Amino acid sequence: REIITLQLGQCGNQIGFEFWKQLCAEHGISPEGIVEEFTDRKDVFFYQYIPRAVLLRVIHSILNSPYAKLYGNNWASGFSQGEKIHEDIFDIIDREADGSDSLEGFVLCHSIAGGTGSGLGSYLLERLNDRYPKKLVQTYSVFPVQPYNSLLTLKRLTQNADCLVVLDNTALNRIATDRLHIQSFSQINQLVSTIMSASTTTLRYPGYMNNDLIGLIASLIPTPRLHFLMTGYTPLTTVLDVMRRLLQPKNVMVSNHCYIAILNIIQGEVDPTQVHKSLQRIRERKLANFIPWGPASIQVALSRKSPYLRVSGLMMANHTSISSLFERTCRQYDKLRKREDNFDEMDTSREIVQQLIDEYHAATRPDYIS
Amino acid sequence: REIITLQLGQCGNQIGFEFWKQLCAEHGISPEGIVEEFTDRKDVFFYQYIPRAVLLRVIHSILNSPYAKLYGNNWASGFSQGEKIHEDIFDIIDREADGSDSLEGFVLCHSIAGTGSGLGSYLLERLNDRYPKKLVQTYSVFPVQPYNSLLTLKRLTQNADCLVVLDNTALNRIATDRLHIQSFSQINQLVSTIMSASTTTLRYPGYMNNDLIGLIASLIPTPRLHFLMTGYTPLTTVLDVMRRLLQPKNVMVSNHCYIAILNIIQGEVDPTQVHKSLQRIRERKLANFIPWGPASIQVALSRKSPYLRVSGLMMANHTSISSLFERTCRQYDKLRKREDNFDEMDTSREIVQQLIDEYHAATRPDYIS
Amino acid sequence: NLMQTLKKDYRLVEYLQAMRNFFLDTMYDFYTSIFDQNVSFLNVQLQELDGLTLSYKVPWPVDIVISLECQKIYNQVFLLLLQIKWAKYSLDVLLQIHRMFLLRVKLMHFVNSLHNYIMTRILHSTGLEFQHQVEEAKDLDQLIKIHYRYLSTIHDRCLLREKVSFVKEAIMKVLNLALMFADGWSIEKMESDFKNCHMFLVTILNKAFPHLESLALS
Amino acid sequence: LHGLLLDQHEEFFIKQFSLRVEILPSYIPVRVAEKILFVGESVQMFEKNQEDTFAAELHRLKQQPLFSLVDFEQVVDRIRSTVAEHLWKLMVEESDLLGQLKIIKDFYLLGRGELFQAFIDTAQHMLKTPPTAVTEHDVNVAFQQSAHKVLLDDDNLLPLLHLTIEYHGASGWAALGLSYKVQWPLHILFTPAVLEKYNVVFKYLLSVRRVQAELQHCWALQMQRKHQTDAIKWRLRNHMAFLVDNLQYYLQVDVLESQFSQLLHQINSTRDFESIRLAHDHFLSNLLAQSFILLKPVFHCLNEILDLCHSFCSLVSQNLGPLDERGAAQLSILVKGFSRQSSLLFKILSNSDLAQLLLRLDYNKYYTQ
Numbered sequence A: 001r002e003i004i005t006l007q008l009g010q011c012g013n014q015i016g017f018e019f020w021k022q023l024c025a026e027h028g029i030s031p032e033g034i035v036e037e038f039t040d041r042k043d044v045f046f047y048q049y050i051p052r053a054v055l056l057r058v059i060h061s062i063l064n065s066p067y068a069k070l071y072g073n074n075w076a077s078g079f080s081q082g083e084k085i086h087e088d089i090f091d092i093i094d095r096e097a098d099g100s101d102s103l104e105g106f107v108l109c110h111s112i113a114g115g116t117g118s119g120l121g122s123y124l125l126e127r128l129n130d131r132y133p134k135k136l137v138q139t140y141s142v143f144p145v146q147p148y149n150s151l152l153t154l155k156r157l158t159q160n161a162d163c164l165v166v167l168d169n170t171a172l173n174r175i176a177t178d179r180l181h182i183q184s185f186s187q188i189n190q191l192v193s194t195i196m197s198a199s200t201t202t203l204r205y206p207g208y209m210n211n212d213l214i215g216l217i218a219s220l221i222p223t224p225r226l227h228f229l230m231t232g233y234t235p236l237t238t239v240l241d242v243m244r245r246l247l248q249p250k251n252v253m254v255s256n257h258c259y260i261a262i263l264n265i266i267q268g269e270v271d272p273t274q275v276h277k278s279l280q281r282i283r284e285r286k287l288a289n290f291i292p293w294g295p296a297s298i299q300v301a302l303s304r305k306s307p308y309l310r311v312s313g314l315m316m317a318n319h320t321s322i323s324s325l326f327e328r329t330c331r332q333y334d335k336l337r338k339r340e341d342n343f344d345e346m347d348t349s350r351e352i353v354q355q356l357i358d359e360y361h362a363a364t365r366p367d368y369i370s
Numbered sequence B: 001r002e003i004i005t006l007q008l009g010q011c012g013n014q015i016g017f018e019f020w021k022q023l024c025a026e027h028g029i030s031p032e033g034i035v036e037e038f039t040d041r042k043d044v045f046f047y048q049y050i051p052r053a054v055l056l057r058v059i060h061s062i063l064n065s066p067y068a069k070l071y072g073n074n075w076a077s078g079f080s081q082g083e084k085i086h087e088d089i090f091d092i093i094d095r096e097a098d099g100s101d102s103l104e105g106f107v108l109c110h111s112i113a114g115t116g117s118g119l120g121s122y123l124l125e126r127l128n129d130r131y132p133k134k135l136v137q138t139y140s141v142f143p144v145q146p147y148n149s150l151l152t153l154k155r156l157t158q159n160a161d162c163l164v165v166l167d168n169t170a171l172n173r174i175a176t177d178r179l180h181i182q183s184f185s186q187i188n189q190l191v192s193t194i195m196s197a198s199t200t201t202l203r204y205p206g207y208m209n210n211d212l213i214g215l216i217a218s219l220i221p222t223p224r225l226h227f228l229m230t231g232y233t234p235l236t237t238v239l240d241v242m243r244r245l246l247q248p249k250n251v252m253v254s255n256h257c258y259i260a261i262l263n264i265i266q267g268e269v270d271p272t273q274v275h276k277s278l279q280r281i282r283e284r285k286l287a288n289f290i291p292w293g294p295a296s297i298q299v300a301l302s303r304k305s306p307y308l309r310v311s312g313l314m315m316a317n318h319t320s321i322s323s324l325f326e327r328t329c330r331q332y333d334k335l336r337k338r339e340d341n342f343d344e345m346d347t348s349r350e351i352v353q354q355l356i357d358e359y360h361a362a363t364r365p366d367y368i369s
Numbered sequence C: 001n002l003m004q005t006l007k008k009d010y011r012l013v014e015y016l017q018a019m020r021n022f023f024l025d026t027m028y029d030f031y032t033s034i035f036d037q038n039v040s041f042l043n044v045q046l047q048e049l050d051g052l053t054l055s056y057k058v059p060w061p062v063d064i065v066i067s068l069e070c071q072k073i074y075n076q077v078f079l080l081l082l083q084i085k086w087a088k089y090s091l092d093v094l095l096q097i098h099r100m101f102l103l104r105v106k107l108m109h110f111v112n113s114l115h116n117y118i119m120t121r122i123l124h125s126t127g128l129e130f131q132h133q134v135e136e137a138k139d140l141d142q143l144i145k146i147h148y149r150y151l152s153t154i155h156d157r158c159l160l161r162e163k164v165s166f167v168k169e170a171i172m173k174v175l176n177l178a179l180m181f182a183d184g185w186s187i188e189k190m191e192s193d194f195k196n197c198h199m200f201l202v203t204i205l206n207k208a209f210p211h212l213e214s215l216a217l218s
Numbered sequence D: 001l002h003g004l005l006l007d008q009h010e011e012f013f014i015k016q017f018s019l020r021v022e023i024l025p026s027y028i029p030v031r032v033a034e035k036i037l038f039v040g041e042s043v044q045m046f047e048k049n050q051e052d053t054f055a056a057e058l059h060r061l062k063q064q065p066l067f068s069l070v071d072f073e074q075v076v077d078r079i080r081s082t083v084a085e086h087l088w089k090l091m092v093e094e095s096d097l098l099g100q101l102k103i104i105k106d107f108y109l110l111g112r113g114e115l116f117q118a119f120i121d122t123a124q125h126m127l128k129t130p131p132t133a134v135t136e137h138d139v140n141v142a143f144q145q146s147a148h149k150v151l152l153d154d155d156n157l158l159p160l161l162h163l164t165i166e167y168h169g170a171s172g173w174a175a176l177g178l179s180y181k182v183q184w185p186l187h188i189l190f191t192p193a194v195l196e197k198y199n200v201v202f203k204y205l206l207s208v209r210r211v212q213a214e215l216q217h218c219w220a221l222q223m224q225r226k227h228q229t230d231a232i233k234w235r236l237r238n239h240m241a242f243l244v245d246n247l248q249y250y251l252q253v254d255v256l257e258s259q260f261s262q263l264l265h266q267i268n269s270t271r272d273f274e275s276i277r278l279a280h281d282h283f284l285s286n287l288l289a290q291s292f293i294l295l296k297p298v299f300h301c302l303n304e305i306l307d308l309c310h311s312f313c314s315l316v317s318q319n320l321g322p323l324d325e326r327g328a329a330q331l332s333i334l335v336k337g338f339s340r341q342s343s344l345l346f347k348i349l350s351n352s353d354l355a356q357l358l359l360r361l362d363y364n365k366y367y368t369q
Ligand SMILES: Nc1nc2c(ncn2[C@@H]2O[C@H](COP(=O)(O)OP(=O)(O)O)[C@@H](O)[C@H]2O)c(=O)[nH]1
Pocket: A009, A010, A011, A014, A015, A072, A073, A111, A113, A114, A115, A116, A117, A142, A143, A144, A169, A185, A186, A189, A192
C-alpha cells in the first residue's frame, strides 16, 4: 500500500525537496538514489530506488542541486491553465497508479496563498474525486487579493480533501524569532520538513498497528465535516517529560474550546512501561479539556529514530480553536467585498464555509448531535 | 511536587548561586552536574541533573565559574522593563511550569534595596494573574532607596503567600561579632546556610512536613500577617539549642509578643527529650504569645547531609517586625516634604499603614474585630 | 542463618524494616490523590470513611514472625493515622469575616498537637528502641516476643484498644469538626460546641496511664 | 547427549516431545525434570570437548553405592548451562537464542503486523467459506506471496513457517494455526507444549487484528460517500464501536513491548541457564493473564463485540445505497445490545484493568453511562 505524492506551487515544490532530502537521509540512500552500505521498511515512499513524486522556474533550481538524479497570481488565472493541461498531466498520474501494487492515498503539498496553488491545486481536488473515488486525498496545506485566494480554496478542501493538516506561516515566523533568532524562507523550511518527516514515522518502520495512512486518520476524524488537524513538535528524559510540553500552546503552531482526539508519536527508546503512569497524572492534573458527548481517548505510539543519523516528539491535535483562523480570513474577505463574469461562485463559497465554522462552534456544546 | 527558584538583580543572582553551590555541595552532585558515586529524594529541587533555576551583568560572572554545567536604579524603571519582556521570560516559566509534572511553589530571591525590586514587583502581580493555585514565597532582602522599598512592600502585602525578612544591618552585625570581617561575598555565606537549612525537611524525607505548605501555614494565622523572621545560633542537648535560639542577639531582625515558633533540629538528637524541653520552655517562660489565640511551638527532626555536630534553625512570626517598617515609613515622610501623576506612591503609603496598624492590634487581648 | 538472610533479602530483618516504612516521602503523594472510590484505581496509584484494608506478601522463612493476626494490627494503626493526616492536611491546603481564622488557629493547633504526639512521641520512641533490640536477637522465640512486645504496647499508648467510648470517642467526635468546618468555605454555634468538647476532652482526660500527660498540656 | 531415546515399551519418563508426571520417580523433583527435557529436545531439534566429559560423569554416578540427589543435579545443571550458552550464541550473534526470539515476536506475536494486513487482504475470500481439504495449501502460497509482497526476502526462516488447518477433528479462521519447526539446540527450550500456548495467543491476536481492519474499511466507505437523515446513525455507532476495539488493541504494545523488554533483560544479566527456563516460562504466563484471555468474564464479554461488529461492517458494505429495506430496522437491533455491553464492561472494570480503564476514561465519557 504505497502513497503517491504530488507537489504544486513554488511553496509546495520547495517543502517537498526539503522533505525528500530529509527522508532519504534517515535511510541509507545516497543523493544518487543508490543504497549505501553503512529492517527499515522503505517501500511506502520509494519504488524499486526512486521516490514516487510528481513535481509541477523552480524546477531548474532542483536539477542544479547534486540531487539531480533523484527523479499569474489570480485564482481565475490558475484554474484556466489547469483545464488546458488537463490531459497532459493525468497520464503522468495514471501511469504511476497502475505501476503501484495497491495505491492507497495521495499526499499533496500546496499553499492557498500561492497563486499557482490557488488555481491548480483547487482544480485537481475536484478531478481526483471524479476519476478515482476510493482514494483518500490528504494535503499538507499551509495558510499565509490574498484573502480571496485563501477562502476560494477552502471551499474545495472542505468537500474534496478527506483530511488536512494546516501550517500557519504567522506562528512559524514567530517561532523563528524567539527560539531560533533568524531576524528567510530558506531557514523556516528546516522546521517544516521536521514536521512532515515525523508525521510519517510509524509507517516507515515495522510496528504493531499504524501500518497505513488510514491507521492514523480514522481515529481523529469522526464526522465528514470535522476534518482539520494540527501538529506540535516539542524538541527544539522520560515519557512524562515529553507530554507536558505538547499540551502547552507555546509550541503548537497556532495563533468553549476543547480537542477531539490526540495522537502522540514518540521517536525515542524510552521504557514503554511507565507510559501508563504518565497518562494517569495527566488525567489527574486535567491539563486539556475534552468533549462530553462522544467517547474519545488520548493515544500514544512508539517508533525508532533513524540509526544512521535522545528523545523527540510529535503530537497530532484536533482542536476547535482552529475555527478562529478561518473567521479571521473570512472577516477580511467581507472587508474587501464592500471596498473592492457572474461573481457568483465566490458567493456560494462564503456560504459553505459558514457551515464549517458553524459545525465546530456547535461541536463544543453538549448537544452537537443534530 | 517541585519548587522553582528565581534570582533577580545582582543581589538575587549572587545569593542564589552561592546557595546552589552549598546545596550541590551537600548533595552528592559534582560541580559538573554529574552524579558522584561515593537516600535523598531530590526530584523536588532537581531535574534529571539540572536545577530548575531562572536567573535574571552578573551572568558573565556565573558562567566564568566552573559551575557552567549547572543550567538605572529606579523602581518604575524596573516596572517598565518587565512589561517589555512580559512574554519573553514567561515562556521560560511556562516551558518549565508545564515542563514540570506537578509544580508546588515559587521561591524568590531579590533585594528591595534597584531593578530587581521593580522586576520583582512585576512578577508578583503577574504570577497571581495566571497561576491561582501556586504558592509564592519570597526570601526578600532588606537594607532614593525608601521609594523603591516601600512600593515592593505594597506589592508584597497582598500578592505573596509568605515572606521571610533578611535585613542586611542585623546581618552586618553578625559579620563583625562572630566573624571579625570589618564584605558582600562573606555575609551571603550565612544566607545560604539560612536557605539550605530552611528546606532540609523537604530534601530529606521524614515522617512530618513532606510539603512546603505543611511548614508555613502552621505559623501564619491570617493572610495579612504573613511575615516571618528566622534564627540560627550554632556558629549539647535539645534544651541547649532552643534556649540559645530565643536570645535576641541571634535573630536576623534589627509591647510585643510572638505568634508561633517552628524549629529545625538536624543533629543526631534523641526524640526522648524534646517533649520535656518544651515544658522547661513553658515553665521558665522565656517567651510570650498572643493573648487571644492559644499559640504553640513546633520543632522538627531531620538528617544532616552524610556527604558533608548538632545544629538548628528557628522560624518566627514576631510582632516586633512592625518597627522595621516604621523606619523606612518615617524615611518616606522625610523625603516626601523634602524632595507624571505621583499618585500611586500615596496608594502604597495607605496600604502599608494598614498592615502596621494591624500589628499593633494583633498583640492585644481584643484582636477580635 | 535465618536472621542473617533477613537483614537484607531470607533476610527477615530487612523485610521487617520496609514493613513499618511503607506506612507510618512516599505515602504523602499516595493519600493526597485520595483527597480529591474504585478498588483498582488505588492499585495503580499505590504502585506509582474508615476502610482501605492493606496487606502484604511475606515468604515462609519470615511468615512465622509476621503472622496473619499481625497484619491486622499493623493495618489498625495505619487506618487511624490517615484520618489524622486527613484532618491535618484538610485544614492546611487552603489559605465577623476574619473571625473564621480565629477558629482556624484555635483548631489547626489542636489537631496538629495531637499529630505531633502520636508520631513523634510514640511511633518514633518505641521504634527507636525496637531497632536497638532486634539487632541483638539471639533466639527463634524471643524474636517473636520482642516483636509482639512492640505491637501490643504501641496499640496501648495509641489509645485504640479499650476505653474507646470513654476517651477515644471524644477525639473521634471532635474530628468531625475538622470535616464540617472544612467543607464550609452557624459560625457562632461552632465555638459553643468547640469550647465544650475541647473542655469535655480535658475534663475527661484529667483522670491521668501516666504517659497521657505529654499531651494534656493542650 | 545424542538426541534419541532408546525405548520401545513406554519405559522412559519422556514420551514435539512432552513430559510425564504420573510415572515420574518420587524423590526426583519436578524442577530437574524440566531441565532434562529441555536439553534433550534442544539436541533433537538441532539434529568438540563437551561430549566425552559428560559421558564419564554419567558413568561415575553408577559406581556410587548411594544416589545422592545433591550430586545428580550438580552434573545436569552444567550440561543444561552448557548447551544453553552455545544456543544463546546461535540465537543472537549469527542469527540476528535472541535472534530466534526476535523472529518469534515477529510472526507469532504479530510483531511484523504489516505482513498480516496484506495477508488478510489476499487470503480473505478463500477463508470465509467453511474450510476444506484443499484450502490448506491454497493459503500457504498466499502467505509466501505476502512476504515477497513487502520485499522481505530470506530463504532462511521462511520455509520454517507452515500454516496448518485443523480439519476434520465453522469458519476457516476458527481453525487457523501456525507451527514452527524448532532447530536441534533450541529443542530443550521449545517443547510442543510451550509452542502450544504460543499458538493460542496467535489465534486471539489475529482475530482482533482482522476486525479492526475491515472496520477501518468501513470508515473509508463513509468518507467515500460524501455528497439521508438516518445516514448519520452509522458513524455515530461506527466511531463508537471503533474506540471499543482500537483501545482494546492498544495496551497490547504496552503489554508486549514491555514484558518482552524484561525477558530480553533477564537473559543478558544472569549467566545461569535455569534462570532462562523460569523467566521465559514466567514471561509467557503473563501473556495468558495480562491479555485477559484466561479470565473468562472479560474473555466472554469482548468476544461478543467481535462477531457483533462483523454483522455491522458487512451490513453497510452489503449495499450501495441507504439502509431502507429493513436495513435501518436491522441496525437498531445491534445498538440495543452493544450499548448495553458498553456499560456492562464498565461494570466489570469498576490488578491491571487500570491500565485499560485509564485510556478508556481519560476523556471521562463513560462516567455519563
Ligand atoms: N512555508 C513556506 N511558505 C512559502 C514558501 N514559499 C512561498 N510560500 C508562501 O507562498 C505565498 C506566496 O505565493 P507565491 O509563491 O507568490 O505564488 P506563485 O507566484 O504562484 O508561486 C506566501 O504567502 C508564502 O507564505 C516556503 O518556502 N515556505
